Amino acid sequence: SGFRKMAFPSGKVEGCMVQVTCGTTTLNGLWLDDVVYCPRHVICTSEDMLNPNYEDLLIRKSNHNFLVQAGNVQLRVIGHSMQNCVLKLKVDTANPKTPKYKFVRIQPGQTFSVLACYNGSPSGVYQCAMRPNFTIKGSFLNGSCGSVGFNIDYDCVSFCYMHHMELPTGVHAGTDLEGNFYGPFVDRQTAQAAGTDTTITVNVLAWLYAAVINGDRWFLNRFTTTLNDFNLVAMKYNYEPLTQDHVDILGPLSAQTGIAVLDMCASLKELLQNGMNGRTILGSALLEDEFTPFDVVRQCSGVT
Amino acid sequence: SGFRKMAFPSGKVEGCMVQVTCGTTTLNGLWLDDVVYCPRHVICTSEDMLNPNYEDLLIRKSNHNFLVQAGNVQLRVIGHSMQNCVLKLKVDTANPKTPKYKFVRIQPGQTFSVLACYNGSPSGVYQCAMRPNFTIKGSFLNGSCGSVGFNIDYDCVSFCYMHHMELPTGVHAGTDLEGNFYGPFVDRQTAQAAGTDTTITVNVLAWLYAAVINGDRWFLNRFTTTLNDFNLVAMKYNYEPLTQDHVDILGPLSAQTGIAVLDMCASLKELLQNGMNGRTILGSALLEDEFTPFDVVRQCSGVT
Ligand SMILES: O=C(Nc1cncc2cnccc12)[C@@H]1CCOc2ccc(Cl)cc21
Numbered sequence: 087s088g089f090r091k092m093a094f095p096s097g098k099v100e101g102c103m104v105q106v107t108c109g110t111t112t113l114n115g116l117w118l119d120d121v122v123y124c125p126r127h128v129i130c131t132s133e134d135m136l137n138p139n140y141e142d143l144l145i146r147k148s149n150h151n152f153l154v155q156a157g158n159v160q161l162r163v164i165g166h167s168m169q170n171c172v173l174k175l176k177v178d179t180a181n182p183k184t185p186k187y188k189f190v191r192i193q194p195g196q197t198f199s200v201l202a203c204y205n206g207s208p209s210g211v212y213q214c215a216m217r218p219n220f221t222i223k224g225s226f227l228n229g230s231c232g233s234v235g236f237n238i239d240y241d242c243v244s245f246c247y248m249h250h251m252e253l254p255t256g257v258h259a260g261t262d263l264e265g266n267f268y269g270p271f272v273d274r275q276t277a278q279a280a281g282t283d284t285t286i287t288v289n290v291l292a293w294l295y296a297a298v299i300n301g302d303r304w305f306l307n308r309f310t311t312t313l314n315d316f317n318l319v320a321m322k323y324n325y326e327p328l329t330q331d332h333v334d335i336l337g338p339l340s341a342q343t344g345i346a347v348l349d350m351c352a353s354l355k356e357l358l359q360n361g362m363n364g365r366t367i368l369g370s371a372l373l374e375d376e377f378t379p380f381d382v383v384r385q386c387s388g389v390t
Numbered sequence: 391s392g393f394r395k396m397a398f399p400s401g402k403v404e405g406c407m408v409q410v411t412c413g414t415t416t417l418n419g420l421w422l423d424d425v426v427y428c429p430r431h432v433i434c435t436s437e438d439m440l441n442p443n444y445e446d447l448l449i450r451k452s453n454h455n456f457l458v459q460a461g462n463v464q465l466r467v468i469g470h471s472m473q474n475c476v477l478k479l480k481v482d483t484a485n486p487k488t489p490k491y492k493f494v495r496i497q498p499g500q501t502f503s504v505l506a507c508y509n510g511s512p513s514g515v516y517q518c519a520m521r522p523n524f525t526i527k528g529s530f531l532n533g534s535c536g537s538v539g540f541n542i543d544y545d546c547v548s549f550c551y552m553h554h555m556e557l558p559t560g561v562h563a564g565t566d567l568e569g570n571f572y573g574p575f576v577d578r579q580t581a582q583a584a585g586t587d588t589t590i591t592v593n594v595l596a597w598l599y600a601a602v603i604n605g606d607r608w609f610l611n612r613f614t615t616t617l618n619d620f621n622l623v624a625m626k627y628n629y630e631p632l633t634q635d636h637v638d639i640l641g642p643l644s645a646q647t648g649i650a651v652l653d654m655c656a657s658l659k660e661l662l663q664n665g666m667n668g669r670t671i672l673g674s675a676l677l678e679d680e681f682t683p684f685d686v687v688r689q690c691s692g693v694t
């Protein structure tokens with residue numbers, strides 16, 4: 087028993103973290119096989135970031151200008167190319183610690199673990215979610231760029247995110263491992279609207295099932311609802327509309343607890359309309375939306 | 391910017407995790423040098439746990455009865471001994487992945503990262519605190535026993551905790567790496583009082599400083615207090631009394647923000663007496679006590 091915001095074990099990802107220096111800029115790189123992946127803003131000075139012409143800035147750079155350092159050993163750069171907002175540095179040595187890996191583009195509402203790095207060194211690991219508006223509420227300081235988000239299925243690491251930017255609002259933006267930004271963000275120090283964010287409804291319901299599994303049951307009630315009645319409430323409270331796909335993904339949790347999905351929706355409706363009344367659920371005074379139904383099942387079953 | 395419940399990178403600890411089987415019981419072991427450390431209840435069946443005589447149960451066991459498996463390779467056990475509530479299995483091979491390490495006994499209120507394991511395999515990592523009553527609010531299922539808590543200073547892992555037991559209340563109890571329980575707990579399936587827990591005052595204040603650093607300042611007020619006036623309030627709300635040592639440890643955060651410690655105490659006093667009024671601080675609707683002043687400084691400075 088017990089429910090925690092757990093991150094995947096970070097070892098397989100620590101072994102890929104390298105330091106990438108270009109001119110005066112240093113950020114983090116991801117070394118998989120004979121390729122180092124890093125944000126393309128490694129070629130910019132602070133004044134370049136205002137309105138950078140990346141093609142033109144990269145043209146002034148050569149393989150010898152990119153300093154890649156793994157731990158304490160230098161890697162020889164033999165190729166460089168720009169793919170969207172990432173640079174791919176071909177090095178002459180395959181990373182001996184390259185795990186089984188995939189590059190995946192996660193969906194809004196999905197969760198992942200971030201290994202925060204500075205100067206190619208890992209400082210911490212946390213579990214977070216890709217918000218519906220495609221930002222992440224991370225913990226990133228200067229030099230954190232190039233830090234990656236990932237999931238782990240047994241031995242295969244699915245890299246899903248690379249940190250690029252902190253918006254003036256304090257939220258974070260980044261790309262998939264092909265350099266495509268999540269959301270409408272561009273890699274420029276300019277005004278950028280994050281957009282209206284919503285609460286991930288399926289995740290809150292999943293977390294309410296983890297609460298019932300772990301003993302916190304006070305929020306359970308004598309009521310039920312319909313998808314449409316619940317969705318009217320979700321609209322009023324800036325929650326993502328619940329669809330039959332969300333109900334279907336909640337099937338395993340609904341089966342384990344014996345509480346129908348729409349019955350749990352009625353509980354969520356009452357918590358939305360009445361608040362917590364000074365009580366807590368799984369040690370939290372707000373409705374948690376950073377645990378997916380897959381995460382709750384994984385944590386309550388013990389998948390390693 | 392951004393503030394997260396960050397855990398240390400778990401790689402150095404993943405490389406020490408082994409599976410320990412004795413009879414029909416399997417739990418996790420910690421392989422450092424040529425020694426595997428695991429909870430001594432690995433020698434018990436479920437019926438033994440009611441009132442076990444560990445000396446007598448261990449006497450029926452020989453080195454060949456302890457099956458230690460690292461990944462997919464078996465370790466040869468050449469010695470066994472019981473130290474308090476841990477078994478030390480001398481194996482014939484030193485763990486090649488043994489990092490620089492220390493065995494430390496942490497103080498109540500201090501934090502650490504837990505690498506949850508099942509069958510010697512790491513499933514997740516989370517940051518938690520040793521409660522003032524010496525329990526931990528972890529996330530542990532059957533087979534999690536032998537999972538360890540630790541801190542990391544550059545390259546040195548300080549092992550501070552080994553999971554042993556889940557109390558009927560759903561809280562967790564365990565030992566230091568010499569087998570000494572934190573708190574009054576015994577390794578028996580019997581009624582065990584956890585004791586009155588309190589909120590770690592210094593940690594809440596530290597987290598309030600991290601909120602000011604990161605922008606959440608609404609809770610700041612035109613008031614100040616004294617250690618004694620604040621402590622009367624702390625008493626009423628089951629908060630640990632604040633001492634001059636706590637004020638002293640808050641010095642760096644007080645210096646960074648320019649907000650005197652007793653001025654932040656006055657803010658905490660008002661939050662205790664008036665609640666949050668439906669607002670949040672660092673995305674939380676309650677006062678967080680699982681970040682020490684050292685953790686806030688580390689996270690806001692970027693120590694790797
Ligand atoms: O965001 C960036 N810096 C950081 C990232 N994350 C966290 C931080 C925290 N504190 C200072 C800086 C940070 C860089 C530098 C600023 O201008 C831009 C503009 C667009 C892009 Cl793609 C990157 C950057």
Ligand SMILES: O=C(Nc1cncc2cnccc12)[C@@H]1CCOc2ccc(Cl)cc21
Pocket residue numbers: 087431439530531532533534535554555556557576577578579580
């Ligand atoms: O606590 C224990 N089991 C677990 C630990 N942690 C989490 C769990 C979750 N779910 C089932 C079991 C768990 C073992 C077995 C029960 O009897 C005792 C009594 C004292 C001692 Cl020292 C250990 C044990």
